[PDB]
Design a protein around this ligand. Structure first.
Ligand SMILES: C[C@H](CSCCNC(=O)CCNC(=O)[C@H](O)C(C)(C)COP(=O)(O)OP(=O)(O)OC[C@H]1O[C@@H](n2cnc3c(N)ncnc32)[C@H](O)[C@@H]1OP(=O)(O)O)C(=O)O
Length: 261
Protein backbone atom coordinates (compact mmCIF):
# COMPACT_ATOMS: atom_id res chain seq x y z
CA UNK A 1 0.00 0.00 0.00
CA UNK A 2 1.07 3.52 0.99
CA UNK A 3 2.35 4.65 4.32
CA UNK A 4 3.35 8.10 5.68
CA UNK A 5 6.38 7.33 7.75
CA UNK A 6 7.47 4.28 5.81
CA UNK A 7 8.20 3.10 2.24
CA UNK A 8 7.66 -0.65 1.27
CA UNK A 9 9.00 -2.27 -1.85
CA UNK A 10 8.66 -5.73 -3.27
CA UNK A 11 11.22 -7.61 -5.32
CA UNK A 12 10.05 -11.05 -5.93
CA UNK A 13 9.19 -12.45 -2.49
CA UNK A 14 11.47 -10.08 -0.71
CA UNK A 15 9.82 -7.07 0.93
CA UNK A 16 11.88 -4.03 1.85
CA UNK A 17 10.73 -1.55 4.39
CA UNK A 18 12.38 1.89 4.28
CA UNK A 19 12.20 4.39 6.99
CA UNK A 20 10.76 7.73 5.87
CA UNK A 21 11.26 9.91 9.10
CA UNK A 22 14.27 11.85 7.97
CA UNK A 23 12.97 15.04 9.68
CA UNK A 24 13.19 13.41 13.16
CA UNK A 25 16.26 11.44 12.11
CA UNK A 26 14.10 8.23 12.36
CA UNK A 27 13.53 8.64 15.99
CA UNK A 28 11.17 6.05 17.47
CA UNK A 29 7.96 7.85 17.79
CA UNK A 30 4.65 6.20 18.24
CA UNK A 31 3.58 7.56 14.86
CA UNK A 32 6.53 6.10 13.17
CA UNK A 33 6.50 2.82 15.14
CA UNK A 34 2.85 2.52 14.30
CA UNK A 35 3.38 2.80 10.59
CA UNK A 36 6.25 0.31 10.83
CA UNK A 37 3.85 -2.08 12.43
CA UNK A 38 1.22 -1.53 9.81
CA UNK A 39 3.63 -2.16 7.08
CA UNK A 40 4.83 -5.36 8.59
CA UNK A 41 1.30 -6.49 9.39
CA UNK A 42 0.44 -5.86 5.91
CA UNK A 43 3.44 -7.84 4.56
CA UNK A 44 2.38 -10.95 6.41
CA UNK A 45 1.52 -12.97 3.43
CA UNK A 46 2.34 -16.14 1.82
CA UNK A 47 4.03 -14.40 -1.10
CA UNK A 48 6.36 -12.64 1.18
CA UNK A 49 9.27 -14.68 2.39
CA UNK A 50 11.95 -12.43 3.73
CA UNK A 51 11.75 -8.86 5.08
CA UNK A 52 14.33 -6.14 5.27
CA UNK A 53 14.58 -3.03 7.45
CA UNK A 54 16.51 -0.12 6.10
CA UNK A 55 17.20 3.57 6.14
CA UNK A 56 17.42 5.53 2.99
CA UNK A 57 20.63 5.26 1.15
CA UNK A 58 23.16 7.85 2.10
CA UNK A 59 21.71 8.10 5.59
CA UNK A 60 23.99 9.66 8.15
CA UNK A 61 21.98 8.20 10.94
CA UNK A 62 20.01 5.01 10.94
CA UNK A 63 17.97 5.93 13.95
CA UNK A 64 18.47 8.31 16.86
CA UNK A 65 16.34 6.28 19.11
CA UNK A 66 13.43 7.04 21.25
CA UNK A 67 11.93 10.48 21.01
CA UNK A 68 12.82 12.11 24.27
CA UNK A 69 9.90 14.44 24.25
CA UNK A 70 7.79 11.23 24.06
CA UNK A 71 9.49 10.00 27.19
CA UNK A 72 7.50 10.03 30.37
CA UNK A 73 7.36 12.97 32.71
CA UNK A 74 7.70 10.83 35.81
CA UNK A 75 4.06 9.62 36.39
CA UNK A 76 4.34 6.02 35.17
CA UNK A 77 6.75 3.58 33.64
CA UNK A 78 8.27 4.90 30.32
CA UNK A 79 9.29 1.39 29.27
CA UNK A 80 5.70 0.13 29.93
CA UNK A 81 4.24 -2.94 28.21
CA UNK A 82 2.33 -1.02 25.59
CA UNK A 83 5.30 1.34 24.89
CA UNK A 84 6.17 1.60 21.19
CA UNK A 85 9.56 -0.19 21.52
CA UNK A 86 8.12 -3.09 23.39
CA UNK A 87 5.54 -3.69 20.68
CA UNK A 88 7.67 -3.60 17.64
CA UNK A 89 10.26 -5.82 19.19
CA UNK A 90 7.79 -8.39 20.39
CA UNK A 91 6.35 -8.07 16.96
CA UNK A 92 9.53 -8.48 15.05
CA UNK A 93 10.33 -11.54 17.14
CA UNK A 94 7.00 -13.38 16.76
CA UNK A 95 7.05 -12.46 13.04
CA UNK A 96 6.87 -15.67 11.03
CA UNK A 97 9.41 -14.49 8.46
CA UNK A 98 12.99 -13.57 8.61
CA UNK A 99 13.79 -9.99 9.27
CA UNK A 100 17.15 -8.65 8.18
CA UNK A 101 18.59 -5.35 9.17
CA UNK A 102 20.65 -3.60 6.62
CA UNK A 103 22.38 -0.89 8.56
CA UNK A 104 23.65 2.40 7.27
CA UNK A 105 24.77 5.24 9.46
CA UNK A 106 24.54 5.32 13.28
CA UNK A 107 22.26 3.43 15.63
CA UNK A 108 21.27 4.73 19.04
CA UNK A 109 19.77 3.18 22.05
CA UNK A 110 16.35 1.77 21.35
CA UNK A 111 17.40 1.32 17.66
CA UNK A 112 20.19 -0.95 18.69
CA UNK A 113 17.90 -3.08 20.81
CA UNK A 114 15.43 -3.08 17.87
CA UNK A 115 17.78 -4.24 15.32
CA UNK A 116 19.26 -6.45 17.91
CA UNK A 117 15.82 -8.07 18.05
CA UNK A 118 15.86 -8.99 14.46
CA UNK A 119 17.25 -12.12 12.85
CA UNK A 120 20.09 -10.87 10.86
CA UNK A 121 22.16 -7.80 10.65
CA UNK A 122 24.23 -6.73 7.72
CA UNK A 123 26.08 -3.45 7.90
CA UNK A 124 28.15 -0.86 6.21
CA UNK A 125 31.71 -0.71 7.16
CA UNK A 126 30.98 2.71 8.49
CA UNK A 127 28.00 2.41 10.73
CA UNK A 128 28.56 2.67 14.47
CA UNK A 129 26.55 1.48 17.34
CA UNK A 130 25.82 2.52 20.80
CA UNK A 131 23.59 1.65 23.75
CA UNK A 132 22.94 4.81 25.75
CA UNK A 133 20.48 4.57 28.67
CA UNK A 134 23.21 5.85 30.98
CA UNK A 135 23.73 9.15 29.22
CA UNK A 136 20.32 10.24 30.29
CA UNK A 137 19.96 8.28 33.45
CA UNK A 138 17.45 5.76 32.19
CA UNK A 139 16.59 2.55 34.03
CA UNK A 140 15.81 0.34 31.01
CA UNK A 141 13.60 -2.59 31.34
CA UNK A 142 14.39 -6.19 31.92
CA UNK A 143 13.17 -7.47 28.62
CA UNK A 144 14.91 -4.74 26.74
CA UNK A 145 18.06 -5.56 28.51
CA UNK A 146 17.66 -9.30 27.88
CA UNK A 147 17.38 -8.93 24.15
CA UNK A 148 20.94 -7.67 24.17
CA UNK A 149 22.35 -10.67 25.95
CA UNK A 150 21.88 -13.16 23.19
CA UNK A 151 24.83 -12.58 20.98
CA UNK A 152 27.71 -10.96 22.79
CA UNK A 153 29.32 -11.77 26.11
CA UNK A 154 28.21 -10.21 29.33
CA UNK A 155 31.38 -8.28 29.86
CA UNK A 156 30.98 -6.82 26.40
CA UNK A 157 27.39 -5.78 26.79
CA UNK A 158 28.33 -4.39 30.11
CA UNK A 159 30.97 -2.31 28.48
CA UNK A 160 28.54 -1.20 25.90
CA UNK A 161 25.90 -0.12 28.25
CA UNK A 162 28.16 1.21 30.95
CA UNK A 163 30.31 3.57 28.89
CA UNK A 164 27.51 4.20 26.37
CA UNK A 165 30.30 4.79 23.83
CA UNK A 166 29.91 3.86 20.22
CA UNK A 167 31.50 0.91 18.61
CA UNK A 168 32.37 0.40 15.02
CA UNK A 169 31.02 -2.24 12.84
CA UNK A 170 34.31 -4.13 12.63
CA UNK A 171 34.25 -4.47 16.36
CA UNK A 172 30.56 -5.21 16.60
CA UNK A 173 31.27 -7.95 14.17
CA UNK A 174 34.21 -9.44 15.91
CA UNK A 175 32.14 -9.65 19.12
CA UNK A 176 29.40 -11.53 17.38
CA UNK A 177 26.73 -8.89 16.99
CA UNK A 178 26.37 -8.55 13.28
CA UNK A 179 26.30 -11.18 10.61
CA UNK A 180 28.16 -9.29 7.99
CA UNK A 181 29.92 -6.05 7.28
CA UNK A 182 30.21 -4.65 3.78
CA UNK A 183 31.28 -1.64 1.88
CA UNK A 184 28.52 0.84 1.32
CA UNK A 185 28.50 0.45 -2.38
CA UNK A 186 27.91 -3.27 -1.90
CA UNK A 187 25.53 -3.16 0.99
CA UNK A 188 22.17 -3.41 -0.90
CA UNK A 189 23.11 -6.06 -3.33
CA UNK A 190 24.69 -8.27 -0.78
CA UNK A 191 21.71 -7.98 1.49
CA UNK A 192 19.37 -8.64 -1.33
CA UNK A 193 21.03 -11.70 -2.68
CA UNK A 194 20.99 -13.14 0.80
CA UNK A 195 17.32 -12.43 1.22
CA UNK A 196 16.55 -13.94 -2.13
CA UNK A 197 18.49 -17.10 -1.26
CA UNK A 198 16.86 -17.45 2.05
CA UNK A 199 13.62 -17.15 0.27
CA UNK A 200 14.29 -20.10 -1.84
CA UNK A 201 13.83 -22.19 1.30
CA UNK A 202 10.93 -23.88 3.09
CA UNK A 203 9.06 -21.01 4.63
CA UNK A 204 7.26 -23.37 6.93
CA UNK A 205 10.45 -24.77 8.30
CA UNK A 206 11.86 -21.35 8.97
CA UNK A 207 8.84 -20.13 10.74
CA UNK A 208 9.00 -22.93 13.26
CA UNK A 209 12.60 -22.80 14.01
CA UNK A 210 12.51 -19.01 14.47
CA UNK A 211 9.78 -19.77 16.90
CA UNK A 212 11.69 -22.38 18.67
CA UNK A 213 14.69 -20.14 18.86
CA UNK A 214 12.49 -17.44 20.28
CA UNK A 215 10.94 -19.75 22.76
CA UNK A 216 14.39 -20.65 23.93
CA UNK A 217 15.95 -17.19 24.29
CA UNK A 218 13.11 -16.35 26.63
CA UNK A 219 13.62 -19.40 28.75
CA UNK A 220 15.09 -17.15 31.45
CA UNK A 221 12.64 -16.95 34.52
CA UNK A 222 12.31 -15.64 38.09
CA UNK A 223 9.83 -15.36 41.03
CA UNK A 224 7.11 -12.82 41.86
CA UNK A 225 9.14 -11.23 44.49
CA UNK A 226 12.22 -10.76 42.38
CA UNK A 227 10.26 -8.94 39.72
CA UNK A 228 8.65 -6.46 42.01
CA UNK A 229 11.95 -5.93 43.62
CA UNK A 230 13.57 -4.76 40.33
CA UNK A 231 10.52 -2.98 39.42
CA UNK A 232 10.71 -1.05 42.63
CA UNK A 233 14.29 0.03 41.88
CA UNK A 234 13.04 0.88 38.43
CA UNK A 235 10.36 3.16 39.85
CA UNK A 236 12.88 4.68 42.16
CA UNK A 237 15.16 5.66 39.26
CA UNK A 238 12.29 7.40 37.62
CA UNK A 239 11.32 9.51 40.58
CA UNK A 240 15.01 10.31 40.77
CA UNK A 241 16.55 13.75 40.54
CA UNK A 242 19.44 12.54 38.45
CA UNK A 243 16.70 11.44 36.09
CA UNK A 244 15.18 14.78 35.42
CA UNK A 245 18.59 16.32 35.18
CA UNK A 246 19.21 13.72 32.50
CA UNK A 247 16.49 14.79 30.09
CA UNK A 248 17.13 18.52 30.75
CA UNK A 249 20.81 18.46 29.97
CA UNK A 250 19.89 17.02 26.60
CA UNK A 251 16.87 19.25 25.90
CA UNK A 252 19.15 22.06 26.98
CA UNK A 253 21.82 20.31 25.04
CA UNK A 254 24.30 20.70 27.89
CA UNK A 255 26.58 18.18 29.62
CA UNK A 256 24.72 16.69 32.66
CA UNK A 257 25.69 16.44 36.30
CA UNK A 258 24.68 13.29 38.09
CA UNK A 259 24.51 13.40 41.83
CA UNK A 260 23.62 9.91 43.01
CA UNK A 261 20.08 10.71 43.66
C1 LIG B 1 18.15 4.49 26.05
C2 LIG B 1 17.70 5.43 24.96
C3 LIG B 1 17.72 6.83 25.50
S1 LIG B 1 16.52 7.96 24.86
C4 LIG B 1 17.40 8.49 23.59
C5 LIG B 1 18.64 7.94 22.98
N1 LIG B 1 19.15 8.68 21.92
C6 LIG B 1 20.51 8.92 21.97
O1 LIG B 1 21.26 8.53 22.85
C7 LIG B 1 20.95 9.71 20.72
C8 LIG B 1 20.96 11.20 21.02
N2 LIG B 1 20.95 11.95 19.82
C9 LIG B 1 22.26 12.23 19.33
O2 LIG B 1 23.30 11.73 19.76
C10 LIG B 1 22.37 13.05 18.07
O3 LIG B 1 21.11 13.74 17.90
C11 LIG B 1 22.76 12.28 16.80
C12 LIG B 1 24.08 11.52 16.98
C13 LIG B 1 21.64 11.29 16.38
C14 LIG B 1 23.01 13.37 15.78
O4 LIG B 1 24.06 14.26 16.17
P1 LIG B 1 23.96 15.49 15.22
O5 LIG B 1 25.08 16.49 15.55
O6 LIG B 1 24.18 14.99 13.77
O7 LIG B 1 22.57 16.16 15.37
P2 LIG B 1 22.06 17.11 16.49
O8 LIG B 1 22.81 16.88 17.83
O9 LIG B 1 22.26 18.57 16.02
O10 LIG B 1 20.59 16.92 16.72
C15 LIG B 1 19.80 17.46 15.73
C16 LIG B 1 18.40 17.39 16.15
O11 LIG B 1 17.98 16.01 16.53
C17 LIG B 1 17.39 16.02 17.84
N3 LIG B 1 17.46 14.87 18.44
C18 LIG B 1 18.48 13.97 18.35
N4 LIG B 1 18.21 12.82 18.94
C19 LIG B 1 16.92 12.96 19.46
C20 LIG B 1 16.05 12.06 20.19
N5 LIG B 1 16.38 10.82 20.53
N6 LIG B 1 14.84 12.52 20.56
C21 LIG B 1 14.51 13.74 20.21
N7 LIG B 1 15.20 14.66 19.55
C22 LIG B 1 16.45 14.21 19.18
C23 LIG B 1 18.14 17.20 18.45
O12 LIG B 1 17.42 17.60 19.66
C24 LIG B 1 17.93 18.25 17.38
O13 LIG B 1 16.77 19.08 17.34
P3 LIG B 1 17.00 20.59 17.37
O14 LIG B 1 18.42 20.91 16.83
O15 LIG B 1 15.91 21.21 16.48
O16 LIG B 1 16.84 21.13 18.80
C25 LIG B 1 16.53 4.82 24.34
O17 LIG B 1 15.26 4.46 25.05
O18 LIG B 1 16.47 4.74 23.14
Amino acid sequence: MSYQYVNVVTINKVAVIEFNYGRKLNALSKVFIDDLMQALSDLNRPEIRCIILRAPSGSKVFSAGHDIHELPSGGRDPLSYDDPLRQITRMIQKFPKPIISMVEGSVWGGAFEMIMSSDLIIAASTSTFSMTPVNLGVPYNLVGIHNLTRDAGFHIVKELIFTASPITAQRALAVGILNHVVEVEELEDFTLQMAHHISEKAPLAIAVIKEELRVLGEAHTMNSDEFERIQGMRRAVYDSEDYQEGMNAFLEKRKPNFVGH
